[PDB]
Design a protein around this ligand. Sequence first.
Ligand SMILES: *[C@@H]1O[C@H](CO)[C@@H](O[C@@H]2O[C@H](CO)[C@@H](O[C@@H]3O[C@H](CO[C@H]4O[C@H](CO)[C@@H](O)[C@H](O)[C@@H]4O[C@@H]4O[C@H](CO)[C@@H](O[C@@H]5O[C@H](CO)[C@H](O)[C@H](O)[C@H]5O)[C@H](O)[C@H]4NC(C)=O)[C@@H](O)[C@H](O[C@H]4O[C@H](CO)[C@@H](O)[C@H](O)[C@@H]4O)[C@@H]3O)[C@H](O)[C@H]2NC(C)=O)[C@H](O)[C@H]1NC(C)=O
Ligand SMILES: CCCCCCCC/C=C/CCCCCCCC(=O)O[C@@H](COC(=O)CCCCCCCCCCCCCCC)COP(=O)([O-])OCC[N+](C)(C)C
Ligand SMILES: CCCCCCCC/C=C/CCCCCCCC(=O)O[C@@H](COC(=O)CCCCCCCCCCCCCCC)COP(=O)([O-])OCC[N+](C)(C)C
Ligand SMILES: CC(C)CCC[C@@H](C)[C@H]1CC[C@H]2[C@@H]3CC=C4C[C@@H](O)CC[C@]4(C)[C@H]3CC[C@]12C
Ligand SMILES: CC(C)CCC[C@@H](C)[C@H]1CC[C@H]2[C@@H]3CC=C4C[C@@H](O)CC[C@]4(C)[C@H]3CC[C@]12C
Lengths: 48, 48
Amino acid sequence: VQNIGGIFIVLAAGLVLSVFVAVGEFLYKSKKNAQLEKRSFCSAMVEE
Amino acid sequence: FSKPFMTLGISILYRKPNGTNPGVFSFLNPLSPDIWMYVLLACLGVSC
Ligand SMILES: *[C@@H]1O[C@H](CO)[C@@H](O[C@@H]2O[C@H](CO)[C@@H](O[C@@H]3O[C@H](CO[C@H]4O[C@H](CO)[C@@H](O)[C@H](O)[C@@H]4O[C@@H]4O[C@H](CO)[C@@H](O[C@@H]5O[C@H](CO)[C@H](O)[C@H](O)[C@H]5O)[C@H](O)[C@H]4NC(C)=O)[C@@H](O)[C@H](O[C@H]4O[C@H](CO)[C@@H](O)[C@H](O)[C@@H]4O)[C@@H]3O)[C@H](O)[C@H]2NC(C)=O)[C@H](O)[C@H]1NC(C)=O
Ligand SMILES: CCCCCCCC/C=C/CCCCCCCC(=O)O[C@@H](COC(=O)CCCCCCCCCCCCCCC)COP(=O)([O-])OCC[N+](C)(C)C
Ligand SMILES: CCCCCCCC/C=C/CCCCCCCC(=O)O[C@@H](COC(=O)CCCCCCCCCCCCCCC)COP(=O)([O-])OCC[N+](C)(C)C
Ligand SMILES: CC(C)CCC[C@@H](C)[C@H]1CC[C@H]2[C@@H]3CC=C4C[C@@H](O)CC[C@]4(C)[C@H]3CC[C@]12C
Ligand SMILES: CC(C)CCC[C@@H](C)[C@H]1CC[C@H]2[C@@H]3CC=C4C[C@@H](O)CC[C@]4(C)[C@H]3CC[C@]12C
């Protein structure tokens, strides 16, 4: 773990980065559906 | 003395060091046994 080590850090870095962009795309389909029914909770709860 | 019937030389008698063989699970050696777990917990983690 002293030798290679840091690829586990960037594996922990990219996946936490990937959960962030996963929510932002989920909130983006709540944004294009915000012109349809309600502001957030219509497209959120149906897609939750 | 007569002429020699054999030619000498002073040297050192000592044991051969025992060449312990690289046993048949030799390919696991280039990574530490906790790193093979850390890779296994990665592919069980990142897949989840
Ligand atoms: C070829 O490849 C092989 C690989 O197997 C190797 O072949 C054999 O390697 C053996 C290991 O060197 C070698 O030694 C014999 O094996 C055992 C070792 O058991 C303990 O024996 C002694 C105690 O009697 C100790 O001196 C040994 O070190 C050993 O383990 C522990 O070591 C401690 C350090 O001395 C010792 O003392 C403690 O030390 C601390 C700090 O100093 C405190 O004071 C503490 O109070 C002390 O107690 C520990 O007590 C000790 N632990 C135990 C549980 O004993 C041994 O049986 C054997 O002979 C001993 O016992 C017989 C019994 O009658 C007696 O005849 C001896 O006098 C001696 O007491 C040897 O030590 C083998 O010789 C060797 N075989 C051959 C054929 O070579 C080779 O290394 C490889 N060859 C090459 C060239 O690399
Ligand atoms: C990149 C891929 C990663 C995969 C993640 C999983 C990895 C998880 C692994 C975790 C640890 C496994 C290895 C242990 C560590 C080795 C050091 C050791 O001391 O062991 C030693 C004891 O021999 C053993 O006991 C080795 C373990 C036996 C099972 C091997 C399964 C292979 C992995 C399954 C993967 C296939 C499936 C993969 C998925 C389809 C070996 O050394 P030795 O040679 O015996 O030296 C002594 C010889 N002598 C006595 C003559 C002197
Ligand atoms: C989400 C996050 C996870 C959640 C947490 C979960 C908890 C997990 C926490 C785990 C904590 C770690 C504890 C284990 C430590 C072992 C290290 C060690 O030193 O022991 C030994 C490991 O050598 C082996 O024997 C390994 C076992 C066989 C290898 C095959 C396993 C994988 C197979 C393929 C996988 C397929 C993959 C499929 C993928 C889909 C090495 O030393 P030894 O000299 O060999 O000792 C011999 C021991 N013996 C005599 C009994 C044999
Ligand atoms: C960075 C985040 C927060 C915002 C941007 C998200 C990106 C990656 C998303 C949002 C809108 C998405 C697009 C929406 C619709 C389509 C049409 C489809 O036929 C192919 C995929 C495609 C072209 C998508 C690709 C990915 C996309 C561009
Ligand atoms: C995504 C997950 C499942 C991967 C496996 C778990 C990760 C997060 C853990 C397991 C063991 C951990 C390592 C254990 C020891 C050290 C040494 C220390 O000086 C720096 C952190 C470091 C390098 C850790 C980094 C994170 C680590 C690799």
